[PDB]
Protein backbone atom coordinates (compact mmCIF):
# COMPACT_ATOMS: atom_id res chain seq x y z
CA UNK A 1 0.00 0.00 0.00
CA UNK A 2 1.18 3.47 -1.11
CA UNK A 3 0.00 7.07 -1.32
CA UNK A 4 0.99 9.55 -4.06
CA UNK A 5 1.17 13.33 -3.90
CA UNK A 6 3.23 16.22 -5.22
CA UNK A 7 5.32 13.91 -7.43
CA UNK A 8 6.43 11.59 -4.61
CA UNK A 9 5.07 8.52 -2.83
CA UNK A 10 4.76 7.27 0.67
CA UNK A 11 5.46 3.58 1.15
CA UNK A 12 3.04 2.22 3.80
CA UNK A 13 4.57 -1.24 4.17
CA UNK A 14 5.84 -0.22 7.67
CA UNK A 15 4.47 2.23 10.25
CA UNK A 16 5.13 5.94 9.74
CA UNK A 17 5.40 8.50 12.49
CA UNK A 18 3.63 11.81 11.89
CA UNK A 19 4.96 14.66 14.04
CA UNK A 20 2.57 17.34 15.30
CA UNK A 21 3.45 20.92 14.48
CA UNK A 22 0.94 23.25 16.17
CA UNK A 23 1.15 26.78 14.80
CA UNK A 24 -1.69 28.25 17.00
CA UNK A 25 -0.32 30.78 19.53
CA UNK A 26 9.31 34.42 15.85
CA UNK A 27 6.61 32.02 14.65
CA UNK A 28 7.91 30.85 11.25
CA UNK A 29 11.54 30.39 12.35
CA UNK A 30 10.36 28.45 15.42
CA UNK A 31 8.00 26.21 13.41
CA UNK A 32 10.83 25.32 10.98
CA UNK A 33 13.22 24.60 13.93
CA UNK A 34 10.64 22.18 15.34
CA UNK A 35 10.04 20.56 11.96
CA UNK A 36 13.75 20.02 11.62
CA UNK A 37 14.04 18.35 15.02
CA UNK A 38 11.10 16.03 14.17
CA UNK A 39 12.57 15.02 10.81
CA UNK A 40 15.93 14.35 12.52
CA UNK A 41 14.06 12.21 15.08
CA UNK A 42 12.59 10.15 12.17
CA UNK A 43 9.15 11.65 11.45
CA UNK A 44 8.29 11.06 7.82
CA UNK A 45 5.18 13.27 7.90
CA UNK A 46 4.69 16.63 9.61
CA UNK A 47 1.10 17.59 10.55
CA UNK A 48 0.75 21.38 10.46
CA UNK A 49 -2.35 22.80 12.29
CA UNK A 50 -3.45 26.42 12.96
CA UNK A 51 -7.00 26.10 14.41
CA UNK A 52 -7.30 24.67 17.94
CA UNK A 53 -9.61 21.64 18.22
CA UNK A 54 -10.39 22.77 21.85
CA UNK A 55 -13.95 23.10 23.30
CA UNK A 56 -14.64 26.87 23.64
CA UNK A 57 -12.48 28.82 21.16
CA UNK A 58 -13.96 31.05 18.51
CA UNK A 59 -13.26 29.68 15.08
CA UNK A 60 -10.15 31.36 13.66
CA UNK A 61 -10.81 33.53 10.60
CA UNK A 62 -9.85 32.32 7.12
CA UNK A 63 -7.24 35.18 6.90
CA UNK A 64 -5.66 34.26 10.29
CA UNK A 65 -5.55 30.52 9.44
CA UNK A 66 -3.91 31.20 6.06
CA UNK A 67 -1.31 33.42 7.79
CA UNK A 68 -0.42 30.75 10.36
CA UNK A 69 -0.46 27.72 8.07
CA UNK A 70 0.62 28.60 4.51
CA UNK A 71 4.08 30.13 5.22
CA UNK A 72 4.88 27.12 7.39
CA UNK A 73 3.81 24.52 4.79
CA UNK A 74 5.72 26.51 2.19
CA UNK A 75 8.95 26.77 4.24
CA UNK A 76 8.91 23.03 5.01
CA UNK A 77 8.19 22.01 1.38
CA UNK A 78 11.05 24.07 0.07
CA UNK A 79 13.63 22.91 2.60
CA UNK A 80 12.86 19.22 3.38
CA UNK A 81 11.65 16.05 1.56
CA UNK A 82 9.25 15.09 4.33
CA UNK A 83 5.51 14.71 3.68
CA UNK A 84 3.31 17.50 5.03
CA UNK A 85 -0.23 16.99 6.25
CA UNK A 86 -2.41 20.03 6.78
CA UNK A 87 -4.93 20.06 9.59
CA UNK A 88 -7.73 22.33 8.26
CA UNK A 89 -11.46 22.36 7.48
CA UNK A 90 -11.48 25.48 5.30
CA UNK A 91 -11.58 25.19 1.48
CA UNK A 92 -9.28 28.16 0.96
CA UNK A 93 -6.65 26.74 3.27
CA UNK A 94 -6.96 23.40 1.48
CA UNK A 95 -6.43 25.07 -1.89
CA UNK A 96 -3.58 27.31 -0.82
CA UNK A 97 -1.81 24.52 1.10
CA UNK A 98 -1.81 22.27 -1.99
CA UNK A 99 -0.35 25.14 -4.03
CA UNK A 100 2.68 25.42 -1.76
CA UNK A 101 3.38 21.64 -1.51
CA UNK A 102 1.13 19.90 1.08
CA UNK A 103 0.69 16.17 0.62
CA UNK A 104 -2.28 15.20 2.83
CA UNK A 105 -5.48 16.98 3.77
CA UNK A 106 -6.16 16.04 7.36
CA UNK A 107 -9.55 17.40 8.23
CA UNK A 108 -11.00 16.46 11.61
CA UNK A 109 -14.44 17.39 10.16
CA UNK A 110 -13.97 15.08 7.14
CA UNK A 111 -14.67 17.96 4.65
CA UNK A 112 -18.07 18.67 6.04
CA UNK A 113 -17.68 22.45 5.68
CA UNK A 114 -19.30 24.17 2.70
CA UNK A 115 -16.94 23.90 -0.29
CA UNK A 116 -14.35 21.74 1.50
CA UNK A 117 -15.13 18.59 -0.42
CA UNK A 118 -14.93 20.27 -3.80
CA UNK A 119 -11.65 22.00 -2.76
CA UNK A 120 -10.08 18.72 -1.61
CA UNK A 121 -11.23 17.02 -4.86
CA UNK A 122 -9.66 19.85 -6.93
CA UNK A 123 -6.23 19.46 -5.27
CA UNK A 124 -6.09 15.71 -6.09
CA UNK A 125 -4.35 15.13 -2.76
CA UNK A 126 -4.78 12.28 -0.29
CA UNK A 127 -7.56 12.96 2.25
CA UNK A 128 -7.92 11.63 5.80
CA UNK A 129 -11.44 10.89 7.00
CA UNK A 130 -11.66 11.09 10.76
CA UNK A 131 -14.67 10.04 12.87
CA UNK A 132 -16.09 12.62 15.27
CA UNK A 133 -19.41 12.58 17.07
CA UNK A 134 -20.91 16.07 16.80
CA UNK A 135 -18.60 19.09 16.67
CA UNK A 136 -15.54 20.14 18.66
CA UNK A 137 -17.44 22.73 20.77
CA UNK A 138 -19.76 20.17 22.40
CA UNK A 139 -18.61 16.64 21.38
CA UNK A 140 -17.32 15.92 24.96
CA UNK A 141 -20.51 16.95 26.82
CA UNK A 142 -22.17 13.53 26.68
CA UNK A 143 -20.66 11.08 24.20
CA UNK A 144 -23.02 8.16 23.56
CA UNK A 145 -23.05 5.06 21.36
CA UNK A 146 -25.07 1.88 21.21
CA UNK A 147 -22.13 0.28 19.41
CA UNK A 148 -19.11 2.55 18.98
CA UNK A 149 -17.24 0.25 16.56
CA UNK A 150 -20.29 -0.27 14.30
CA UNK A 151 -21.16 3.46 14.39
CA UNK A 152 -17.60 4.49 13.45
CA UNK A 153 -17.50 1.79 10.80
CA UNK A 154 -20.77 2.95 9.31
CA UNK A 155 -19.51 6.55 9.28
CA UNK A 156 -16.50 5.44 7.23
CA UNK A 157 -18.80 3.63 4.75
CA UNK A 158 -20.90 6.84 4.33
CA UNK A 159 -17.92 9.20 4.10
CA UNK A 160 -16.11 7.02 1.57
CA UNK A 161 -19.25 7.11 -0.64
CA UNK A 162 -19.49 10.90 -0.24
CA UNK A 163 -15.87 11.37 -1.33
CA UNK A 164 -16.22 8.95 -4.28
CA UNK A 165 -19.36 10.85 -5.47
CA UNK A 166 -17.30 14.07 -5.46
CA UNK A 167 -14.57 12.44 -7.62
CA UNK A 168 -12.12 11.55 -4.87
CA UNK A 169 -11.12 7.93 -5.60
CA UNK A 170 -10.77 5.34 -2.80
CA UNK A 171 -6.99 5.22 -3.47
CA UNK A 172 -6.66 8.77 -2.08
CA UNK A 173 -8.40 8.06 1.24
CA UNK A 174 -7.11 7.32 4.76
CA UNK A 175 -9.34 6.41 7.73
CA UNK A 176 -8.93 7.54 11.36
CA UNK A 177 -11.37 6.47 14.12
CA UNK A 178 -10.81 9.77 15.88
CA UNK A 179 -9.64 8.96 19.34
CA UNK A 180 -11.08 11.43 21.85
CA UNK A 181 -13.54 13.05 19.37
CA UNK A 182 -16.91 12.61 20.99
CA UNK A 183 -15.75 9.52 22.90
CA UNK A 184 -15.42 8.58 26.56
CA UNK A 185 -12.67 6.38 27.97
CA UNK A 186 -14.44 3.08 27.31
CA UNK A 187 -15.42 4.12 23.74
CA UNK A 188 -11.78 4.84 22.99
CA UNK A 189 -10.52 1.44 24.23
CA UNK A 190 -13.32 -0.40 22.38
CA UNK A 191 -12.08 1.21 19.15
CA UNK A 192 -8.43 0.56 19.91
CA UNK A 193 -9.10 -3.12 20.76
CA UNK A 194 -10.86 -3.67 17.41
CA UNK A 195 -8.71 -1.41 15.26
CA UNK A 196 -7.53 -4.22 12.96
CA UNK A 197 -11.12 -4.87 11.89
CA UNK A 198 -11.09 -1.48 10.07
CA UNK A 199 -8.65 -3.04 7.51
CA UNK A 200 -11.66 -4.48 5.61
CA UNK A 201 -11.85 -1.14 3.67
CA UNK A 202 -8.32 -1.81 2.33
CA UNK A 203 -7.40 1.79 3.17
CA UNK A 204 -4.54 3.30 5.23
CA UNK A 205 -5.31 3.70 8.94
CA UNK A 206 -4.10 6.78 10.80
CA UNK A 207 -4.45 7.10 14.57
CA UNK A 208 -3.74 9.84 17.05
CA UNK A 209 -3.69 9.00 20.74
CA UNK A 210 -0.55 10.96 21.85
CA UNK A 211 -1.02 12.56 25.30
CA UNK A 212 -4.82 12.30 25.08
CA UNK A 213 -7.30 11.89 27.90
CA UNK A 214 -7.72 8.19 27.07
CA UNK A 215 -4.25 7.87 28.64
CA UNK A 216 -4.63 10.65 31.27
CA UNK A 217 -7.96 9.44 32.64
CA UNK A 218 -6.79 5.81 32.70
CA UNK A 219 -3.53 6.50 34.54
CA UNK A 220 -4.66 9.60 36.44
CA UNK A 221 -1.68 11.66 35.22
CA UNK A 222 -1.35 15.13 33.72
CA UNK A 223 -0.54 16.01 30.09
CA UNK A 224 3.27 16.00 30.52
CA UNK A 225 3.26 12.56 32.21
CA UNK A 226 1.74 10.49 29.38
CA UNK A 227 4.73 9.39 27.25
CA UNK A 228 4.75 5.73 28.42
CA UNK A 229 0.97 5.46 27.86
CA UNK A 230 1.29 7.18 24.46
CA UNK A 231 3.97 4.65 23.41
CA UNK A 232 1.77 1.76 24.57
CA UNK A 233 -1.13 3.11 22.47
CA UNK A 234 1.13 3.56 19.43
CA UNK A 235 2.49 0.05 19.76
CA UNK A 236 -0.95 -1.48 20.22
CA UNK A 237 -2.21 0.24 17.05
CA UNK A 238 0.92 -0.46 14.99
CA UNK A 239 0.86 -4.15 15.97
CA UNK A 240 -2.65 -4.23 14.46
CA UNK A 241 -1.28 -2.74 11.21
CA UNK A 242 -2.00 0.99 11.66
CA UNK A 243 -0.03 2.79 8.93
CA UNK A 244 0.47 6.23 10.41
CA UNK A 245 0.82 7.26 14.07
CA UNK A 246 0.33 10.94 14.92
CA UNK A 247 2.44 11.98 17.89
CA UNK A 248 4.16 14.68 19.91
CA UNK A 249 7.12 12.53 20.96
CA UNK A 250 8.75 11.56 17.69
CA UNK A 251 12.11 9.97 18.61
CA UNK A 252 10.54 7.65 21.18
CA UNK A 253 7.69 6.67 18.88
CA UNK A 254 10.06 5.95 15.95
CA UNK A 255 12.10 3.67 18.22
CA UNK A 256 9.00 1.80 19.34
CA UNK A 257 7.90 1.48 15.69
CA UNK A 258 11.26 -0.16 14.78
CA UNK A 259 10.59 -2.79 17.45
CA UNK A 260 7.08 -3.29 16.07
CA UNK A 261 8.41 -3.68 12.53
CA UNK A 262 11.05 -6.20 13.55
CA UNK A 263 8.29 -8.20 15.25
CA UNK A 264 5.85 -7.96 12.31
CA UNK A 265 8.58 -8.94 9.82
CA UNK A 266 9.37 -12.11 11.87
CA UNK A 267 5.62 -12.97 11.91
CA UNK A 268 4.32 -15.09 9.00
CA UNK A 269 1.09 -13.10 8.56
CA UNK A 270 2.42 -9.47 9.21
CA UNK A 271 -0.35 -8.41 11.71
CA UNK A 272 -1.96 -8.92 15.19
CA UNK A 273 -5.73 -9.42 15.59
CA UNK B 274 -8.57 -17.19 35.88
CA UNK B 275 -4.92 -18.31 36.16
CA UNK B 276 -3.29 -17.97 39.62
CA UNK B 277 -0.08 -18.93 41.42
CA UNK B 278 0.12 -19.83 45.14
CA UNK B 279 3.03 -19.50 47.48
CA UNK B 280 3.74 -18.68 51.10
CA UNK B 281 0.05 -18.48 51.93
CA UNK B 282 -0.81 -15.88 49.32
CA UNK B 283 -1.74 -15.88 45.69
CA UNK B 284 -0.93 -13.97 42.57
CA UNK B 285 -3.89 -13.19 40.26
CA UNK B 286 -2.64 -13.52 36.66
CA UNK B 287 -5.78 -12.23 34.94
CA UNK B 288 -3.80 -9.02 34.09
CA UNK B 289 -0.08 -8.42 33.44
CA UNK B 290 2.25 -8.08 36.40
CA UNK B 291 5.43 -6.06 36.43
CA UNK B 292 8.41 -7.69 38.10
CA UNK B 293 11.12 -5.26 39.17
CA UNK B 294 14.81 -6.21 39.06
CA UNK B 295 16.61 -5.69 42.36
CA UNK B 296 20.43 -5.51 42.60
CA UNK B 297 22.05 -6.97 45.64
CA UNK B 298 25.22 -4.96 46.14
CA UNK B 299 24.19 -1.07 54.17
CA UNK B 300 23.63 -3.35 51.23
CA UNK B 301 20.51 -4.31 53.10
CA UNK B 302 19.34 -0.76 53.73
CA UNK B 303 19.88 0.14 50.10
CA UNK B 304 18.21 -3.04 48.75
CA UNK B 305 15.13 -2.35 50.90
CA UNK B 306 15.06 1.32 49.73
CA UNK B 307 15.05 0.16 46.11
CA UNK B 308 12.38 -2.47 46.78
CA UNK B 309 10.26 0.27 48.30
CA UNK B 310 10.66 2.52 45.23
CA UNK B 311 9.66 -0.33 42.90
CA UNK B 312 6.59 -1.24 45.00
CA UNK B 313 5.58 2.46 44.98
CA UNK B 314 6.01 2.40 41.22
CA UNK B 315 3.58 -0.55 41.02
CA UNK B 316 5.80 -3.69 40.83
CA UNK B 317 3.94 -6.63 42.26
CA UNK B 318 6.95 -8.97 42.20
CA UNK B 319 10.60 -8.18 43.03
CA UNK B 320 13.28 -10.27 41.41
CA UNK B 321 16.25 -10.45 43.83
CA UNK B 322 19.61 -10.56 42.06
CA UNK B 323 20.16 -7.96 39.28
CA UNK B 324 23.82 -7.31 38.41
CA UNK B 325 25.11 -9.86 40.98
CA UNK B 326 23.28 -12.73 39.13
CA UNK B 327 23.51 -11.77 35.45
CA UNK B 328 25.31 -14.25 33.18
CA UNK B 329 29.06 -13.66 33.42
CA UNK B 330 28.85 -12.25 37.01
CA UNK B 331 31.42 -13.68 39.40
CA UNK B 332 30.55 -16.96 41.05
CA UNK B 333 30.48 -17.04 44.82
CA UNK B 334 30.64 -19.67 47.54
CA UNK B 335 27.47 -21.10 49.06
CA UNK B 336 28.20 -19.18 52.32
CA UNK B 337 28.69 -15.90 50.51
CA UNK B 338 25.57 -16.31 48.40
CA UNK B 339 23.49 -17.10 51.48
CA UNK B 340 24.89 -14.03 53.25
CA UNK B 341 23.95 -11.73 50.33
CA UNK B 342 20.57 -13.19 49.34
CA UNK B 343 18.83 -14.47 52.46
CA UNK B 344 18.85 -11.19 54.50
CA UNK B 345 17.40 -9.31 51.47
CA UNK B 346 14.62 -11.81 50.86
CA UNK B 347 13.92 -11.87 54.59
CA UNK B 348 13.77 -8.08 54.95
CA UNK B 349 11.42 -7.69 52.00
CA UNK B 350 9.14 -10.52 53.19
CA UNK B 351 8.93 -8.87 56.64
CA UNK B 352 8.09 -5.37 55.37
CA UNK B 353 6.05 -5.69 52.24
CA UNK B 354 3.22 -7.75 50.69
CA UNK B 355 4.94 -8.02 47.34
CA UNK B 356 5.93 -11.33 45.76
CA UNK B 357 9.67 -12.16 45.73
CA UNK B 358 11.47 -14.07 43.03
CA UNK B 359 14.95 -15.25 43.90
CA UNK B 360 17.82 -15.71 41.41
CA UNK B 361 19.93 -18.68 42.40
CA UNK B 362 21.23 -22.01 41.12
CA UNK B 363 22.25 -23.48 44.50
CA UNK B 364 20.07 -25.94 46.45
CA UNK B 365 20.95 -24.45 49.83
CA UNK B 366 19.97 -20.99 48.73
CA UNK B 367 16.73 -22.34 47.26
CA UNK B 368 15.92 -24.01 50.56
CA UNK B 369 16.88 -21.13 52.81
CA UNK B 370 15.15 -18.55 50.54
CA UNK B 371 11.91 -20.53 50.80
CA UNK B 372 12.24 -20.55 54.61
CA UNK B 373 12.39 -16.76 54.83
CA UNK B 374 9.50 -16.11 52.41
CA UNK B 375 10.46 -16.31 48.71
CA UNK B 376 7.64 -16.96 46.30
CA UNK B 377 9.32 -17.92 42.98
CA UNK B 378 12.57 -19.75 42.16
CA UNK B 379 14.28 -18.09 39.21
CA UNK B 380 17.22 -20.17 38.09
CA UNK B 381 18.65 -19.17 34.68
CA UNK B 382 20.57 -22.49 34.74
CA UNK B 383 17.28 -24.44 34.91
CA UNK B 384 18.01 -26.34 38.18
CA UNK B 385 21.01 -28.04 36.53
CA UNK B 386 23.33 -27.87 39.56
CA UNK B 387 23.52 -31.06 41.65
CA UNK B 388 20.58 -31.15 44.08
CA UNK B 389 18.86 -27.96 42.75
CA UNK B 390 15.81 -29.75 41.24
CA UNK B 391 15.24 -31.77 44.40
CA UNK B 392 15.57 -28.61 46.53
CA UNK B 393 13.07 -26.69 44.36
CA UNK B 394 10.67 -29.65 44.62
CA UNK B 395 11.02 -29.74 48.42
CA UNK B 396 10.05 -26.05 48.77
CA UNK B 397 6.76 -26.53 46.91
CA UNK B 398 7.30 -23.05 45.35
CA UNK B 399 6.59 -21.83 41.86
CA UNK B 400 9.52 -22.40 39.48
CA UNK B 401 10.39 -20.43 36.33
CA UNK B 402 11.62 -22.60 33.46
CA UNK B 403 13.69 -20.36 31.21
CA UNK B 404 15.13 -21.45 27.88
CA UNK B 405 18.91 -20.94 27.47
CA UNK B 406 21.52 -22.46 25.07
CA UNK B 407 23.42 -19.09 18.24
CA UNK B 408 22.00 -21.45 15.63
CA UNK B 409 18.59 -22.93 15.49
CA UNK B 410 16.70 -24.76 12.83
CA UNK B 411 13.42 -23.39 14.08
CA UNK B 412 14.07 -21.37 17.23
CA UNK B 413 10.48 -21.59 18.27
CA UNK B 414 10.36 -25.30 17.82
CA UNK B 415 13.46 -25.83 19.86
CA UNK B 416 12.28 -23.56 22.63
CA UNK B 417 8.90 -25.34 22.56
CA UNK B 418 10.56 -28.78 22.76
CA UNK B 419 12.70 -27.54 25.65
CA UNK B 420 9.53 -26.55 27.55
CA UNK B 421 7.97 -30.00 26.90
CA UNK B 422 11.12 -31.69 28.21
CA UNK B 423 11.56 -29.44 31.26
CA UNK B 424 7.92 -29.76 32.23
CA UNK B 425 8.30 -33.60 32.20
CA UNK B 426 11.53 -33.41 34.20
CA UNK B 427 9.87 -31.22 36.83
CA UNK B 428 6.80 -33.47 37.03
CA UNK B 429 9.09 -36.53 37.50
CA UNK B 430 10.73 -34.71 40.43
CA UNK B 431 7.28 -34.07 42.02
CA UNK B 432 6.84 -30.45 40.90
CA UNK B 433 3.27 -30.27 39.61
CA UNK B 434 2.39 -28.31 36.40
CA UNK B 435 0.46 -25.76 38.52
CA UNK B 436 3.77 -24.54 39.97
CA UNK B 437 5.48 -23.85 36.66
CA UNK B 438 6.05 -20.68 34.63
CA UNK B 439 7.59 -20.64 31.13
CA UNK B 440 10.04 -18.06 29.86
CA UNK B 441 11.54 -18.26 26.33
CA UNK B 442 14.72 -16.54 27.62
CA UNK B 443 15.20 -13.53 25.44
CA UNK B 444 18.89 -12.92 24.77
CA UNK B 445 20.04 -16.35 26.15
CA UNK B 446 21.89 -17.97 23.29
CA UNK B 447 19.87 -16.00 20.70
CA UNK B 448 20.73 -13.53 17.95
CA UNK B 449 18.58 -10.59 16.99
CA UNK B 450 16.39 -12.53 14.51
CA UNK B 451 15.88 -15.43 16.93
CA UNK B 452 14.65 -13.04 19.60
CA UNK B 453 12.11 -11.37 17.28
CA UNK B 454 10.92 -14.77 15.99
CA UNK B 455 10.12 -15.79 19.56
CA UNK B 456 8.49 -12.46 20.36
CA UNK B 457 6.32 -12.57 17.20
CA UNK B 458 5.07 -16.08 18.08
CA UNK B 459 4.89 -15.70 21.87
CA UNK B 460 1.10 -16.31 22.04
CA UNK B 461 1.60 -19.81 20.63
CA UNK B 462 3.32 -20.84 23.93
CA UNK B 463 -0.16 -20.56 25.61
CA UNK B 464 -0.93 -24.17 24.48
CA UNK B 465 0.83 -25.41 27.70
CA UNK B 466 -1.77 -23.51 29.70
CA UNK B 467 0.98 -22.15 31.95
CA UNK B 468 1.97 -18.62 32.97
CA UNK B 469 4.40 -16.87 30.59
CA UNK B 470 7.17 -14.69 31.96
CA UNK B 471 9.40 -12.57 29.70
CA UNK B 472 12.41 -10.38 30.19
CA UNK B 473 13.52 -8.11 27.38
CA UNK B 474 14.28 -4.94 29.38
CA UNK B 475 17.35 -3.08 28.00
CA UNK B 476 18.64 -6.20 26.22
CA UNK B 477 20.69 -6.36 23.06
CA UNK B 478 17.56 -7.24 21.02
CA UNK B 479 16.71 -3.54 21.52
CA UNK B 480 20.26 -2.08 21.58
CA UNK B 481 21.36 -3.80 18.37
CA UNK B 482 18.12 -2.92 16.58
CA UNK B 483 18.18 0.75 17.52
CA UNK B 484 21.97 1.18 17.82
CA UNK B 485 21.72 2.75 21.29
CA UNK B 486 23.51 2.10 24.57
CA UNK B 487 22.10 0.40 27.69
CA UNK B 488 20.65 3.58 29.22
CA UNK B 489 18.83 4.64 26.02
CA UNK B 490 16.56 1.60 25.62
CA UNK B 491 13.42 2.58 27.55
CA UNK B 492 11.15 3.22 24.53
CA UNK B 493 12.27 -0.07 22.94
CA UNK B 494 11.86 -1.94 26.24
CA UNK B 495 8.29 -0.59 26.58
CA UNK B 496 7.47 -1.63 23.03
CA UNK B 497 8.73 -5.14 23.79
CA UNK B 498 6.70 -5.30 27.03
CA UNK B 499 3.54 -4.13 25.27
CA UNK B 500 3.98 -6.54 22.41
CA UNK B 501 4.36 -9.47 24.83
CA UNK B 502 1.52 -8.35 27.13
CA UNK B 503 -0.84 -7.92 24.19
CA UNK B 504 -0.16 -11.58 23.46
CA UNK B 505 -1.13 -12.49 27.03
CA UNK B 506 2.27 -12.66 28.73
CA UNK B 507 1.56 -12.74 32.47
CA UNK B 508 4.71 -11.33 33.99
CA UNK B 509 7.12 -8.76 32.54
CA UNK B 510 10.58 -8.48 34.11
CA UNK B 511 11.95 -4.96 33.91
CA UNK B 512 14.35 -2.31 35.13
CA UNK B 513 11.96 0.58 34.49
CA UNK B 514 9.00 -0.20 36.72
CA UNK B 515 6.81 2.94 36.71
CA UNK B 516 6.82 3.25 32.92
CA UNK B 517 6.14 -0.42 32.36
CA UNK B 518 3.21 -0.43 34.88
CA UNK B 519 1.64 2.50 33.03
CA UNK B 520 2.05 0.68 29.66
CA UNK B 521 0.51 -2.44 31.22
CA UNK B 522 -2.54 -0.46 32.33
CA UNK B 523 -3.07 0.59 28.73
CA UNK B 524 -2.68 -3.02 27.60
CA UNK B 525 -5.18 -4.15 30.27
CA UNK B 526 -7.76 -1.58 29.26
CA UNK B 527 -7.39 -2.69 25.62
CA UNK B 528 -7.58 -6.44 26.43
CA UNK B 529 -10.70 -5.85 28.55
CA UNK B 530 -12.47 -4.11 25.72
CA UNK B 531 -11.59 -7.01 23.37
CA UNK B 532 -14.00 -9.96 23.22
CA UNK B 533 -10.99 -12.24 23.02
CA UNK B 534 -8.82 -10.76 25.71
CA UNK B 535 -5.74 -11.53 23.56
CA UNK B 536 -3.74 -10.71 20.35
CA UNK B 537 -2.38 -13.41 18.01
Ligand SMILES: Nc1nc2[nH]c(SCC(=O)O)nc2c(=O)[nH]1
Pocket residue numbers: 053087106108128130176178179206207208209210211212246
Ligand atom coordinates in the same frame (compact mmCIF):
# COMPACT_ATOMS: atom_id res chain seq x y z
N1 LIG C 1 -6.17 12.80 11.95
C1 LIG C 1 -6.19 13.24 13.28
N2 LIG C 1 -5.98 14.55 13.46
C2 LIG C 1 -6.01 14.93 14.75
N3 LIG C 1 -5.83 16.20 15.20
C3 LIG C 1 -5.96 16.11 16.50
S1 LIG C 1 -5.83 17.45 17.61
C4 LIG C 1 -6.09 16.79 19.30
C5 LIG C 1 -4.79 16.32 20.01
O1 LIG C 1 -3.69 16.19 19.39
O2 LIG C 1 -5.00 16.06 21.23
N4 LIG C 1 -6.21 14.83 16.91
C6 LIG C 1 -6.25 14.06 15.78
C7 LIG C 1 -6.45 12.74 15.52
O3 LIG C 1 -6.70 11.84 16.50
N5 LIG C 1 -6.42 12.33 14.25
Ligand SMILES: Nc1nc2[nH]c(SCC(=O)O)nc2c(=O)[nH]1
Pocket residue numbers: 326327328379381401403440442443470471472473474475476510
Ligand atom coordinates in the same frame (compact mmCIF):
# COMPACT_ATOMS: atom_id res chain seq x y z
N1 LIG D 1 13.40 -15.33 34.25
C1 LIG D 1 14.35 -14.51 33.65
N2 LIG D 1 15.38 -14.17 34.42
C2 LIG D 1 16.29 -13.39 33.81
N3 LIG D 1 17.44 -12.90 34.37
C3 LIG D 1 18.02 -12.21 33.39
S1 LIG D 1 19.52 -11.36 33.50
C4 LIG D 1 19.84 -10.63 31.86
C5 LIG D 1 19.27 -9.20 31.78
O1 LIG D 1 18.51 -8.77 32.69
O2 LIG D 1 19.67 -8.55 30.78
N4 LIG D 1 17.27 -12.22 32.26
C6 LIG D 1 16.17 -12.99 32.50
C7 LIG D 1 15.07 -13.36 31.77
O3 LIG D 1 14.86 -13.00 30.46
N5 LIG D 1 14.16 -14.14 32.37
